[PDB]
Short mmCIF file of all heavy atoms in Angstrom, two decimals:
data_model
loop_
_atom_site.label_atom_id
_atom_site.label_comp_id
_atom_site.label_asym_id
_atom_site.label_seq_id
_atom_site.Cartn_x
_atom_site.Cartn_y
_atom_site.Cartn_z
N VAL A 148 -8.19 -8.10 -18.03
CA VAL A 148 -9.16 -7.16 -17.54
C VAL A 148 -8.47 -5.83 -17.33
O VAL A 148 -7.49 -5.75 -16.58
CB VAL A 148 -9.73 -7.61 -16.17
CG1 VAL A 148 -10.74 -6.61 -15.64
CG2 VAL A 148 -10.38 -8.98 -16.28
N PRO A 149 -9.00 -4.76 -17.94
CA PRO A 149 -8.49 -3.43 -17.60
C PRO A 149 -8.91 -3.00 -16.19
O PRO A 149 -10.07 -3.14 -15.85
CB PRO A 149 -9.10 -2.53 -18.69
CG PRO A 149 -9.70 -3.48 -19.71
CD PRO A 149 -10.07 -4.75 -18.96
N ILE A 150 -7.96 -2.50 -15.40
CA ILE A 150 -8.23 -2.02 -14.05
C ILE A 150 -7.27 -0.89 -13.75
O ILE A 150 -6.10 -0.99 -14.14
CB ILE A 150 -8.14 -3.17 -13.05
CG1 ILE A 150 -8.36 -2.71 -11.59
CG2 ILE A 150 -6.88 -4.00 -13.18
CD1 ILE A 150 -8.49 -3.91 -10.60
N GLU A 151 -7.79 0.17 -13.13
CA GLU A 151 -7.00 1.27 -12.77
C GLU A 151 -6.81 1.19 -11.26
O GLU A 151 -7.76 1.03 -10.56
CB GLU A 151 -7.62 2.55 -13.28
CG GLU A 151 -6.79 3.80 -13.03
CD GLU A 151 -7.44 5.10 -13.51
OE1 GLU A 151 -8.20 5.09 -14.51
OE2 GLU A 151 -7.23 6.11 -12.84
N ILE A 152 -5.55 1.26 -10.82
CA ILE A 152 -5.25 1.10 -9.38
C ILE A 152 -4.52 2.35 -8.95
O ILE A 152 -3.37 2.53 -9.42
CB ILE A 152 -4.41 -0.17 -9.09
CG1 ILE A 152 -5.08 -1.44 -9.61
CG2 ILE A 152 -4.04 -0.27 -7.59
CD1 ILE A 152 -4.22 -2.63 -9.64
N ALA A 153 -5.07 3.09 -7.99
CA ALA A 153 -4.53 4.37 -7.52
C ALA A 153 -4.01 5.21 -8.71
O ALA A 153 -2.93 5.73 -8.72
CB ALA A 153 -3.47 4.11 -6.50
N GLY A 154 -4.76 5.24 -9.80
CA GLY A 154 -4.41 6.11 -10.93
C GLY A 154 -3.64 5.44 -12.04
O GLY A 154 -3.43 6.05 -13.15
N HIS A 155 -3.16 4.25 -11.80
CA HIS A 155 -2.30 3.56 -12.75
C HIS A 155 -3.10 2.50 -13.52
O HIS A 155 -3.67 1.57 -12.90
CB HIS A 155 -1.18 2.86 -11.97
CG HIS A 155 -0.28 3.80 -11.26
ND1 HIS A 155 0.73 4.53 -11.92
CD2 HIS A 155 -0.24 4.18 -9.96
CE1 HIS A 155 1.37 5.28 -11.04
NE2 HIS A 155 0.83 5.04 -9.83
N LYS A 156 -3.14 2.60 -14.85
CA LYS A 156 -3.89 1.70 -15.65
C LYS A 156 -3.07 0.44 -15.95
O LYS A 156 -1.93 0.54 -16.47
CB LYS A 156 -4.27 2.41 -16.95
CG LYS A 156 -5.28 3.54 -16.79
CD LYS A 156 -5.27 4.44 -17.98
CE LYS A 156 -6.11 5.69 -17.81
NZ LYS A 156 -7.48 5.42 -18.31
N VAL A 157 -3.60 -0.74 -15.62
CA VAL A 157 -2.97 -2.00 -15.91
C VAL A 157 -4.04 -2.92 -16.53
O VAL A 157 -5.26 -2.59 -16.57
CB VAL A 157 -2.27 -2.63 -14.69
CG1 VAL A 157 -1.20 -1.70 -14.13
CG2 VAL A 157 -3.25 -2.98 -13.62
N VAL A 158 -3.58 -4.03 -17.08
CA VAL A 158 -4.47 -5.04 -17.60
C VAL A 158 -3.93 -6.37 -17.07
O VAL A 158 -2.74 -6.71 -17.33
CB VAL A 158 -4.52 -5.04 -19.15
CG1 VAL A 158 -5.17 -6.32 -19.68
CG2 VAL A 158 -5.19 -3.78 -19.69
N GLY A 159 -4.77 -7.15 -16.38
CA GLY A 159 -4.32 -8.39 -15.86
C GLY A 159 -5.49 -9.28 -15.48
O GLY A 159 -6.64 -9.01 -15.77
N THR A 160 -5.16 -10.33 -14.72
CA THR A 160 -6.15 -11.26 -14.30
C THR A 160 -6.80 -10.74 -13.02
O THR A 160 -6.14 -10.32 -12.11
CB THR A 160 -5.51 -12.64 -14.08
OG1 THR A 160 -4.91 -13.04 -15.32
CG2 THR A 160 -6.52 -13.65 -13.59
N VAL A 161 -8.12 -10.86 -12.96
CA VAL A 161 -8.92 -10.51 -11.87
C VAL A 161 -9.85 -11.67 -11.50
O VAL A 161 -10.62 -12.16 -12.31
CB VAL A 161 -9.77 -9.24 -12.17
CG1 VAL A 161 -10.67 -8.89 -11.04
CG2 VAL A 161 -8.84 -8.07 -12.45
N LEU A 162 -9.83 -12.05 -10.21
CA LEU A 162 -10.73 -13.05 -9.74
C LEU A 162 -11.96 -12.38 -9.10
O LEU A 162 -11.84 -11.39 -8.37
CB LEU A 162 -10.00 -13.90 -8.69
CG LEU A 162 -8.65 -14.46 -9.10
CD1 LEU A 162 -8.11 -15.32 -8.01
CD2 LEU A 162 -8.68 -15.21 -10.38
N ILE A 163 -13.14 -12.96 -9.32
CA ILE A 163 -14.40 -12.43 -8.81
C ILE A 163 -15.01 -13.52 -7.92
O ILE A 163 -15.27 -14.63 -8.40
CB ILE A 163 -15.34 -12.00 -9.99
CG1 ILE A 163 -14.72 -10.89 -10.84
CG2 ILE A 163 -16.72 -11.63 -9.45
CD1 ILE A 163 -14.54 -9.59 -10.15
N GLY A 164 -15.22 -13.22 -6.63
CA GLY A 164 -15.86 -14.17 -5.79
C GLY A 164 -15.94 -13.67 -4.38
O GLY A 164 -15.57 -12.53 -4.15
N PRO A 165 -16.40 -14.51 -3.42
CA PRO A 165 -16.42 -14.14 -1.99
C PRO A 165 -15.10 -13.77 -1.31
O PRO A 165 -14.10 -14.54 -1.25
CB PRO A 165 -16.91 -15.46 -1.34
CG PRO A 165 -17.73 -16.14 -2.42
CD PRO A 165 -16.95 -15.85 -3.69
N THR A 166 -15.07 -12.58 -0.73
CA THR A 166 -13.95 -12.19 0.04
C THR A 166 -14.45 -11.15 1.02
O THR A 166 -15.22 -10.27 0.65
CB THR A 166 -12.79 -11.74 -0.88
OG1 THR A 166 -11.82 -11.14 -0.02
CG2 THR A 166 -13.24 -10.77 -1.95
N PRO A 167 -13.98 -11.18 2.27
CA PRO A 167 -14.32 -10.15 3.23
C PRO A 167 -13.87 -8.74 2.81
O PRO A 167 -14.38 -7.75 3.33
CB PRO A 167 -13.58 -10.56 4.51
CG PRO A 167 -12.67 -11.67 4.17
CD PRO A 167 -13.15 -12.24 2.85
N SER A 168 -12.94 -8.66 1.85
CA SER A 168 -12.42 -7.41 1.36
C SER A 168 -11.92 -7.57 -0.07
O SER A 168 -11.23 -8.56 -0.34
CB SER A 168 -11.27 -7.01 2.19
OG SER A 168 -10.83 -5.70 1.82
N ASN A 169 -12.18 -6.59 -0.95
CA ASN A 169 -11.49 -6.54 -2.21
C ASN A 169 -9.99 -6.42 -1.93
O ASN A 169 -9.53 -5.69 -1.04
CB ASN A 169 -11.87 -5.31 -3.03
CG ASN A 169 -13.33 -5.29 -3.43
OD1 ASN A 169 -13.93 -6.35 -3.65
ND2 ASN A 169 -13.89 -4.10 -3.70
N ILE A 170 -9.23 -7.20 -2.69
CA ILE A 170 -7.76 -7.19 -2.47
C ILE A 170 -7.03 -7.18 -3.83
O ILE A 170 -7.41 -7.82 -4.83
CB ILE A 170 -7.20 -8.31 -1.59
CG1 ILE A 170 -7.55 -9.65 -2.22
CG2 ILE A 170 -7.62 -8.18 -0.12
CD1 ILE A 170 -7.06 -10.85 -1.46
N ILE A 171 -5.94 -6.42 -3.82
CA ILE A 171 -4.96 -6.28 -4.95
C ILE A 171 -3.71 -7.08 -4.56
O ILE A 171 -3.10 -6.77 -3.51
CB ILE A 171 -4.61 -4.80 -5.24
CG1 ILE A 171 -5.81 -3.87 -5.42
CG2 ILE A 171 -3.68 -4.73 -6.39
CD1 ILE A 171 -6.82 -4.40 -6.40
N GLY A 172 -3.42 -8.10 -5.33
CA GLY A 172 -2.32 -8.97 -4.97
C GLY A 172 -1.14 -8.69 -5.83
O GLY A 172 -1.06 -7.72 -6.61
N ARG A 173 -0.15 -9.56 -5.67
CA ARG A 173 1.13 -9.25 -6.24
C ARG A 173 1.05 -9.27 -7.77
O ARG A 173 1.96 -8.68 -8.41
CB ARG A 173 2.21 -10.22 -5.76
CG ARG A 173 2.49 -10.27 -4.26
CD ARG A 173 3.63 -11.16 -3.81
NE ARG A 173 3.36 -12.57 -4.09
CZ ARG A 173 3.71 -13.30 -5.12
NH1 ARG A 173 4.48 -12.84 -6.12
NH2 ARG A 173 3.24 -14.53 -5.18
N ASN A 174 0.14 -10.03 -8.35
CA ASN A 174 0.06 -10.07 -9.86
C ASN A 174 -0.05 -8.67 -10.45
O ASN A 174 0.43 -8.46 -11.56
CB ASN A 174 -1.04 -11.00 -10.38
CG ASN A 174 -2.42 -10.47 -10.13
OD1 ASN A 174 -2.76 -10.11 -8.99
ND2 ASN A 174 -3.19 -10.29 -11.20
N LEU A 175 -0.80 -7.77 -9.77
CA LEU A 175 -0.99 -6.43 -10.23
C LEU A 175 -0.04 -5.47 -9.52
O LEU A 175 0.41 -4.54 -10.17
CB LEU A 175 -2.45 -5.97 -10.05
CG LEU A 175 -3.46 -6.80 -10.83
CD1 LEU A 175 -4.81 -6.12 -10.70
CD2 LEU A 175 -3.09 -6.95 -12.33
N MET A 176 0.34 -5.71 -8.26
CA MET A 176 1.27 -4.81 -7.53
C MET A 176 2.64 -4.80 -8.23
O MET A 176 3.31 -3.77 -8.31
CB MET A 176 1.43 -5.19 -6.05
CG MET A 176 0.21 -4.91 -5.21
SD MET A 176 0.40 -5.35 -3.43
CE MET A 176 1.52 -4.06 -2.89
N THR A 177 3.03 -5.92 -8.84
CA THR A 177 4.31 -5.96 -9.62
C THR A 177 4.22 -5.01 -10.81
O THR A 177 5.26 -4.42 -11.18
CB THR A 177 4.67 -7.37 -10.04
OG1 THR A 177 3.54 -7.97 -10.72
CG2 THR A 177 5.15 -8.16 -8.84
N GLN A 178 3.00 -4.87 -11.39
CA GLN A 178 2.88 -3.98 -12.57
C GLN A 178 3.04 -2.52 -12.14
O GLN A 178 3.39 -1.67 -12.95
CB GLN A 178 1.58 -4.27 -13.33
CG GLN A 178 1.45 -5.69 -13.83
CD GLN A 178 2.57 -6.05 -14.78
OE1 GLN A 178 2.86 -5.27 -15.70
NE2 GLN A 178 3.26 -7.17 -14.53
N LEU A 179 2.79 -2.21 -10.87
CA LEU A 179 3.01 -0.89 -10.36
C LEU A 179 4.44 -0.61 -9.92
O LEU A 179 4.68 0.55 -9.51
CB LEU A 179 2.09 -0.63 -9.15
CG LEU A 179 0.60 -0.94 -9.34
CD1 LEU A 179 -0.19 -0.60 -8.08
CD2 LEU A 179 0.06 -0.20 -10.54
N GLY A 180 5.31 -1.61 -9.86
CA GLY A 180 6.65 -1.47 -9.36
C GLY A 180 6.66 -1.32 -7.85
O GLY A 180 7.61 -0.80 -7.26
N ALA A 181 5.66 -1.90 -7.19
CA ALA A 181 5.58 -1.78 -5.71
C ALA A 181 6.72 -2.50 -5.00
O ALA A 181 7.18 -3.61 -5.36
CB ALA A 181 4.25 -2.27 -5.15
N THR A 182 7.16 -1.91 -3.88
CA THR A 182 8.15 -2.49 -3.01
C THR A 182 7.73 -2.38 -1.54
O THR A 182 7.06 -1.43 -1.16
CB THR A 182 9.52 -1.83 -3.10
OG1 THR A 182 9.44 -0.43 -2.83
CG2 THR A 182 10.12 -2.08 -4.47
N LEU A 183 8.21 -3.33 -0.76
CA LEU A 183 8.06 -3.26 0.66
C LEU A 183 9.43 -2.92 1.23
O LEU A 183 10.48 -3.37 0.80
CB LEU A 183 7.56 -4.62 1.05
CG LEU A 183 6.96 -4.86 2.38
CD1 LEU A 183 5.87 -3.88 2.77
CD2 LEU A 183 6.46 -6.31 2.34
N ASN A 184 9.44 -1.96 2.15
CA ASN A 184 10.71 -1.44 2.63
C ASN A 184 10.74 -1.53 4.15
O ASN A 184 9.81 -1.01 4.79
CB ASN A 184 10.84 0.03 2.21
CG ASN A 184 10.85 0.19 0.68
OD1 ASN A 184 11.86 0.51 0.12
ND2 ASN A 184 9.78 -0.09 -0.03
#
């Protein structure tokens, strides 16, 4: 699935279903090179 996250275009797996909040998990955060510091 193509998805743009804070300006960055990635393609990955997206789950669609009930959640109290839309969430971006590590499958896509790794494509951004995200780190926790």
Side-chain angles (χ1 to χ4, degrees):
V148 179
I150 178 171
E151 184 182 329
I152 304 167
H155 296 282
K156 292 162 188 269
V157 302
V158 166
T160 301
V161 178
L162 309 183
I163 298 295
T166 170
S168 186
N169 296 328
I170 59 180
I171 309 310
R173 300 184 295 94
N174 71 308
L175 299 188
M176 289 180 72
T177 52
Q178 301 300 313
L179 310 181
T182 57
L183 196 50
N184 298 251

